[PDB]
Amino acid sequence: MSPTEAPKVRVTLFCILVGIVLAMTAVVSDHWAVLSPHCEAAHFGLWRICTKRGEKNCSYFSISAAAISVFSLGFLIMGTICALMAFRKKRDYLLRPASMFYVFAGLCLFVSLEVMRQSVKRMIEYYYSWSFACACAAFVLLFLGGISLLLFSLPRMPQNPWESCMDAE
Amino acid sequence: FYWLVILIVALNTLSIASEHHNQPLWLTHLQDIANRVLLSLFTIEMLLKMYGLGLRQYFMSIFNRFDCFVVCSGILELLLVESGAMTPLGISVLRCIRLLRLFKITKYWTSLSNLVASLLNSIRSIASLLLLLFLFIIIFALLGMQLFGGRYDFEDTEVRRSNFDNFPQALISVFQVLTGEDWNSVMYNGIMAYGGPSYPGVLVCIYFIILFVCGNYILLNVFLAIAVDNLAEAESLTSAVNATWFTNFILLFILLSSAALAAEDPIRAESVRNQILGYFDIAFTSVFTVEIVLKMTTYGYFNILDLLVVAVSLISMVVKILRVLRVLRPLRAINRAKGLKHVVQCVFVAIRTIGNIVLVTTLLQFMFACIGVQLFKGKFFSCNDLSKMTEEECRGYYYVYKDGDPTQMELRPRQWIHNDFHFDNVLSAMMSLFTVSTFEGWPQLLYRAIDSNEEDMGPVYNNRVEMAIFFIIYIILIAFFMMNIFVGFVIVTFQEQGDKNQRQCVQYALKARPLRCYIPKNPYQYQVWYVVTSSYFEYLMFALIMLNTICLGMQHYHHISDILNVAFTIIFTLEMILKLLAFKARGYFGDPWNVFDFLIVIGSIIDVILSEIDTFLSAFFRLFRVMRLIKLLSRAEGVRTLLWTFIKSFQALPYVALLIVMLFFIYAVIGMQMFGKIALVDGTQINRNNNFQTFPQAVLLLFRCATGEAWQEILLACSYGKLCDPESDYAPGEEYTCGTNFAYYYFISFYMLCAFLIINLFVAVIMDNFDYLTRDWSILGPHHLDEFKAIWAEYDPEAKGRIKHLDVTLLRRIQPPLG
Amino acid sequence: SIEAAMKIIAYGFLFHQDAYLRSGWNVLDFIIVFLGVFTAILEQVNVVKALRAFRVLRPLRLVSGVPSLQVVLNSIFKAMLPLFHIALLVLFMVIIYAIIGLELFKGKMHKTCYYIGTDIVATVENEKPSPCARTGSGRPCTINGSECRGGWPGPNHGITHFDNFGFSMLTVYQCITMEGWTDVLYWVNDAIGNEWPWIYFVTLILLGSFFILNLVLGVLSGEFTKEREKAKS
Numbered sequence A: 001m002s003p004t005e006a007p008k009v010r011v012t013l014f015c016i017l018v019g020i021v022l023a024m025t026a027v028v029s030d031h032w033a034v035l036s037p038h039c040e041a042a043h044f045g046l047w048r049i050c051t052k053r054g055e056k057n058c059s060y061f062s063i064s065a066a067a068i069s070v071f072s073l074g075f076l077i078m079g080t081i082c083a084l085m086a087f088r089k090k091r092d093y094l095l096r097p098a099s100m101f102y103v104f105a106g107l108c109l110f111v112s113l114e115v116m117r118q119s120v121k122r123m124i125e126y127y128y129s130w131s132f133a134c135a136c137a138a139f140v141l142l143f144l145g146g147i148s149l150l151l152f153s154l155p156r157m158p159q160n161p162w163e164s165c166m167d168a169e
Numbered sequence B: 001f002y003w004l005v006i007l008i009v010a011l012n013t014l015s016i017a018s019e020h021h022n023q024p025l026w027l028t029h030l031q032d033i034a035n036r037v038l039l040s041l042f043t044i045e046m047l048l049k050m051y052g053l054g055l056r057q058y059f060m061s062i063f064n065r066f067d068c069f070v071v072c073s074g075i076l077e078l079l080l081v082e083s084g085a086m087t088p089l090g091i092s093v094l095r096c097i098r099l100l101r102l103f104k105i106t107k108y109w110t111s112l113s114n115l116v117a118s119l120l121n122s123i124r125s126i127a128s129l130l131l132l133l134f135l136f137i138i139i140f141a142l143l144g145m146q147l148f149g150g151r152y153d154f155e156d157t158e159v160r161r162s163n164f165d166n167f168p169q170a171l172i173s174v175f176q177v178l179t180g181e182d183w184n185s186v187m188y189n190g191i192m193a194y195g196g197p198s199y200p201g202v203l204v205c206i207y208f209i210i211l212f213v214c215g216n217y218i219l220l221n222v223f224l225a226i227a228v229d230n231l232a233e234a235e236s237l238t239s240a241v242n243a244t245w246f247t248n249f250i251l252l253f254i255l256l257s258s259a260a261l262a263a264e265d266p267i268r269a270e271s272v273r274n275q276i277l278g279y280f281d282i283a284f285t286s287v288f289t290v291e292i293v294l295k296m297t298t299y300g301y302f303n304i305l306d307l308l309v310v311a312v313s314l315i316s317m318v319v320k321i322l323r324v325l326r327v328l329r330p331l332r333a334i335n336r337a338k339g340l341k342h343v344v345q346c347v348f349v350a351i352r353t354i355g356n357i358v359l360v361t362t363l364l365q366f367m368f369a370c371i372g373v374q375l376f377k378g379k380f381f382s383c384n385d386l387s388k389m390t391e392e393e394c395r396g397y398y399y400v401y402k403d404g405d406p407t408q409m410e411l412r413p414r415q416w417i418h419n420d421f422h423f424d425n426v427l428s429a430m431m432s433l434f435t436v437s438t439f440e441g442w443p444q445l446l447y448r449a450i451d452s453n454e455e456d457m458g459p460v461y462n463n464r465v466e467m468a469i470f471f472i473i474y475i476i477l478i479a480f481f482m483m484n485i486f487v488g489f490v491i492v493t494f495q496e497q498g499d500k501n502q503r504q505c506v507q508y509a510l511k512a513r514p515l516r517c518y519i520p521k522n523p524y525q526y527q528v529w530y531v532v533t534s535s536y537f538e539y540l541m542f543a544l545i546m547l548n549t550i551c552l553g554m555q556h557y558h559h560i561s562d563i564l565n566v567a568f569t570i571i572f573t574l575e576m577i578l579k580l581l582a583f584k585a586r587g588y589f590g591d592p593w594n595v596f597d598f599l600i601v602i603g604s605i606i607d608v609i610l611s612e613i614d615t616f617l618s619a620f621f622r623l624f625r626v627m628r629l630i631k632l633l634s635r636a637e638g639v640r641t642l643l644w645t646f647i648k649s650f651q652a653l654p655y656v657a658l659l660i661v662m663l664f665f666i667y668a669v670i671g672m673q674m675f676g677k678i679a680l681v682d683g684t685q686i687n688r689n690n691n692f693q694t695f696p697q698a699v700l701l702l703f704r705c706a707t708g709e710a711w712q713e714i715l716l717a718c719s720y721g722k723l724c725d726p727e728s729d730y731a732p733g734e735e736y737t738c739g740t741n742f743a744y745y746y747f748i749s750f751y752m753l754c755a756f757l758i759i760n761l762f763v764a765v766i767m768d769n770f771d772y773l774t775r776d777w778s779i780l781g782p783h784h785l786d787e788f789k790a791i792w793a794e795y796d797p798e799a800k801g802r803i804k805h806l807d808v809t810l811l812r813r814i815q816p817p818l819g
Numbered sequence C: 001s002i003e004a005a006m007k008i009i010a011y012g013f014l015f016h017q018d019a020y021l022r023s024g025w026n027v028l029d030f031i032i033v034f035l036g037v038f039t040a041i042l043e044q045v046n047v048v049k050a051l052r053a054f055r056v057l058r059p060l061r062l063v064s065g066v067p068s069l070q071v072v073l074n075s076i077f078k079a080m081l082p083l084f085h086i087a088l089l090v091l092f093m094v095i096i097y098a099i100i101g102l103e104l105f106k107g108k109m110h111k112t113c114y115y116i117g118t119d120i121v122a123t124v125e126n127e128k129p130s131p132c133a134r135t136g137s138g139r140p141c142t143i144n145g146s147e148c149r150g151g152w153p154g155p156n157h158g159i160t161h162f163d164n165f166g167f168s169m170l171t172v173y174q175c176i177t178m179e180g181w182t183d184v185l186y187w188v189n190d191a192i193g194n195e196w197p198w199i200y201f202v203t204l205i206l207l208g209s210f211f212i213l214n215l216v217l218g219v220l221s222g223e224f225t226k227e228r229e230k231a232k233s
């Protein structure tokens, strides 16, 4: 567990967990992009579009955005499993696949932004308001957390004529 | 006389470097009344000391055998201009040999007269290698005169001066492709002269690829072997508050208090982000002001630099040039860290040793600037239309023809323009020779010096085609010779500070640890494992990688394009899941190559279904199939070792790359301050793509000037004539008041500074590897020891420590160097 | 040719022991004279010129003459074998970057600002004709009477673009030499958008030009040093 209980990696998985909660709130908060035609303002989200002035109501209307976000969440609950079973039975190596999963999570979530971004270009004003910055920060959190955890799990660049990756401890 | 002929030399060299175009008549006479005084003082000095010394034992010095020549040649023109042999520029020869007496400055420096003791064996002994470079240029000029000789018969009025028509003009056109300056436009004329980008046409690119890829190579064997086997022998002959958490916390605040300075809009007087970063400025000054009196509570060059920065950042909580002096907010981090200061003194001690080579290169540039002033004094004027040759003629309006069409004309006022980089005084001459020294824009000065007519007359097409000599001797003797001996000076002052083979090998044998192989149990899975480690399987995977790459280059502009992508995705998925089964996910995730393969496999799988999700009812996700090419370098050990020994040294010295990063930050901020309100307009080099409006654009402009793009035209794109941005705040009437002349110091310095730091980072990384680079691959070394580790871990699959006495048969499996 | 005949007669039928032809820098002169005679006789059969372009190998004969030049020329070839891995790495890195650019910018730089109802490219005095984007994120046309439409060969008369593998591997090599790389960068910026493309070029210059130049200065300087120390003894 020498790489499984380091402080520099425990802080990274802490940042990973913060990214997880920000991504879990960015997928359900359908109030992350406002439209301003001008007194019928609509709040966008990956699932439900709402209207406000009186007549408060959300509905649906680009399946790509929500589907890809679901893919990202699937990567999250695929990666956290292998992450937690890395603490038992000397299974430290498992920290490497988990990290990569998290990385891809971010990537998928990232393109979600893009596609929704593109949708915002087809419709009035626009102001990414509440959970858009949440997702923009969740992407960076998950992406850099995955990358940093991956490098902290991979042993080290040899740096000596005798050292080598894939050594005997 | 050790300080009495120094004065005569100085008063001669200061009168020789005060001539300029349009000098007043009294200076014209003072340089004629004094030109003979400082010659008579030289003949009495070659007299009143020769008699006291001798007449046969005085010519023995190659030093003093030249001091007589200056007088023997000077006495000519005094009693030669009293002749009817006026010869307007024939007297310019007698004037260009007058500055030949500028070499007396070299004599008065022991180093300046000892460095050449081996340089006389540098060029003169190895002028045979400098001859083969010329024999190469002459072959490629004759091949150019065949390929593109007289084929530039274009039906437009566009001018193309770098062509292959005669020999003196093909030599110039090859030298320029060799110095890699604007060579990409000499290729587009060669490609358009044939057909265009057709099939035959584009194959003339080879001529311009072999001439640069194998012409520079020889150039790295000519002017480098001259400066590392001969600048080494010269040196051989010369031989014979106190808690750590507070520091770790406040060091994170100068970074933040710097990033709050950088990402600040410079244009608008009152912007939304301007006041927020002012609030953060005061909120960070209110924190840094507690660390100083604390440093003065526990107590009473490096400890005093934290004070003036807050002093000149809080006074206001002219008026702007102090904000330029607050860009050193991150310059107070050199004391909090260790290596950040341990590198600064190594760059300040690396300058003292290289101080001698930067003094002879400034006198050589000042000697070549005087020649330029005599040759091209005032000849660099021109008119709007090339048909008017004097300033009385170049007045009124004239027609310009768009598209060279005689029936589509525009009226333009004609004006007597003066080239930006000229040779009127010695300062402007030194500026122009500088921009030629960095190889930027030197052909546009060449083809303007070739066309120079007279002292106040416009150019004449191909008037003096011999002037190229001046621009080809200066470029060989400074940009090719002095620059490489300076790099060699750095590389040999770095090489001193760094048996030996026996010591390395015993250290290796002392600190080695074997390799885990994880050969598996359970023969039912051992049969799967044997088929994925056999050489045939690895070579099949290599072949599959190359076939996928060749399948990736087939695509063009204007399906069978994705069925093979899915085929390869599934094949590389299967060779991963089967390898997992063969390693049981405990040995698979050990080898980093397998982690990389896993990453790429799942990435390509995500892309192959991300496209199908869209096509059922993210461009970068397709890059994961391209990156499969890197995984084939896990077999080429000869490339892997080189890459590793250089990435190993690029990571063990980050505190020198942090120097370049801090330099870029400082200069980006100062640039955003000084010239950041210049408007954006096409036709200038300050446009929507290259400007100082934001911070990333300033850093990109600086990275552009670093690689050496047309930085000399940005330097002129911001120099007190410019139109300030509309949305900026200014006074009425002051539109064409933007940009400052301080730019001349902003760029000229930056380049020079960045020329040093980079070289710094380039030699450290090299000297750090001086054991690998200089290693005879035939005798003995750690590659054989890695072979030993391999064959040992073969009989010792798991780590297991040391192994049983007999299985010794591995010594039967070792080859001579260890036998 | 009489000299070559005289030499081949002074040694064997033609070689007879590998004498004249395997004499090092003497097969080259026979090759030169033989193609020269071939072009001369092929002149008087049609009464083209890619065969008289072999007339430029004559200045190599001087190298065959002075043996000191043969010694020098064989030193700059003894140092090019250790540079095999640097070359094998540069070729593969260019091959990778060409494919990346070919996948990302394949056919974007084909619209530009023509004059309305004309086939005349609308630019300003010192500007080069650069791409455009309409209903897009690239740059918009702002000339007075101009409109953005496609069917335009390319930036440098059609020589700089990532369309097939050839033109992409060419415009990658042109940026690897740090010549006019900003021009390619600005054209891609004008075509597709301003924020992403720099990652492709700013990196291609770091790993491509600078890193490779470091490797080359390391392997050469090491080679010169190992030549000097393994010979001064």
Ligand SMILES: CCCCCCCCCCCCCCCCCC(=O)OC[C@H](COP(=O)([O-])OCC[N+](C)(C)C)OC(=O)CCCCCCCCCCCCCCCCC
Pocket: A114, A118, B618, B619, B620, B629, B630, B633, C089, C092, C093, C096, C100, C104, C137, C192, C193, C195, C196, C197, C198, C199, C200, C203, C207
């Ligand atoms: C043999 C060894 C050789 C090793 C050399 C290999 C080194 C790897 C080279 C890096 C490849 C370059 C990265 C992709 C460049 C992005 C392209 C772009 O900006 O615009 C195209 C396009 C932009 O054009 P677009 O029009 O498709 O944009 C989409 C906008 N709409 C939807 C409206 C059309 O970018 C994309 O589409 C997606 C990419 C966005 C950002 C991608 C960056 C991801 C993070 C960087 C990856 C890692 C970089 C390298 C890290 C260090 C490497 C040493």
Ligand SMILES: CCCCCCCCCCCCCCCCCC(=O)OC[C@H](COP(=O)(O)OCCN)OC(=O)CCCCCCCCCCCCCCCCC
Pocket: B358, B362, B420, B421, B427, B428, B430, B431, B434, B741, B744, B745, B748, B749, B750, B752, B753, B755, B756
């Ligand atoms: C900082 C003070 C120290 C001064 C020099 C110290 C010695 C450094 C050696 C420098 C020598 C380089 C030669 C280049 C000469 C510069 C050109 C010049 O002298 O002209 C001044 C220029 C005016 O030129 P002009 O085109 O006529 O302008 C018209 C309207 N003003 O308008 C100008 O004002 C240009 C001023 C030039 C700026 C000089 C600053 C040099 C920066 C380098 C400092 C560090 C050096 C790095 C070396 C370390 C590693 C190599």
Ligand SMILES: CCCCCCCCCCCCCCCCCC(=O)OC[C@H](COP(=O)(O)OCCN)OC(=O)CCCCCCCCCCCCCCCCC
Pocket: B197, B198, B199, B202, B203, B205, B206, B209, B210, B213, B214, B217, C083, C086, C087, C090, C091, C094, C164, C165, C166, C167, C169, C170, C173
């Ligand atoms: C001692 C050092 C020795 C120096 C080394 C010299 C290098 C030799 C250069 C080899 C060039 C090979 C060119 C052969 C290509 C075959 C011609 C062809 O058929 O391709 C045409 C190509 C694309 O097809 P195109 O005709 O444009 O499409 C129109 C519609 N059909 O259209 C094209 O544009 C083809 C042009 C491709 C050119 C690619 C250039 C990149 C290669 C340079 C990287 C090498 C770096 C070397 C570093 C080593 C360091 C020492």
Ligand SMILES: CCCCCCCCCCCCCCCCCC(=O)OC[C@H](COP(=O)(O)OCCN)OC(=O)CCCCCCCCCCCCCCCCC
Pocket: B657, B660, B661, B662, B664, B665, B694, B695, B696, B697, B699, B700, B703, C194, C195, C196, C198, C202, C206, C207, C210, C211
């Ligand atoms: C190996 C040998 C050599 C190694 C030595 C190491 C030295 C390395 C020095 C190289 C530095 C290269 C810096 C290139 C980054 C430039 C970023 C850029 O050009 O992006 C432009 C883009 C424009 O966007 P904007 O300006 O907002 O306007 C458009 C809005 N619609 O902007 C954007 O849209 C995104 C902006 C965010 C990009 C930030 C990432 C980099 C920015 C600066 C990085 C460095 C910071 C400090 C400087 C250090 C650099 C040395």
Ligand SMILES: COC(=O)C1=C(C)NC(C)=C([N+](=O)[O-])[C@H]1c1ccccc1C(F)(F)F
Pocket: B357, B358, B361, B362, B365, B433, B434, B437, B438, B478, B482, B483, B486, B752, B755, B756
């Ligand atoms: C005025 O400066 C100079 O003469 C220099 C010129 C002419 N141009 C460039 C680009 C320089 N540089 O720093 O790379 C220096 C130069 C050049 C040859 C050797 C040494 C230096 C040195 F001055 F930098 F040391």
Ligand SMILES: [Ca+2]
Pocket: B180, B181, B182, B439, B440, B441, B708, B709, B710, C179, C180
């Ligand atoms: Ca250039």
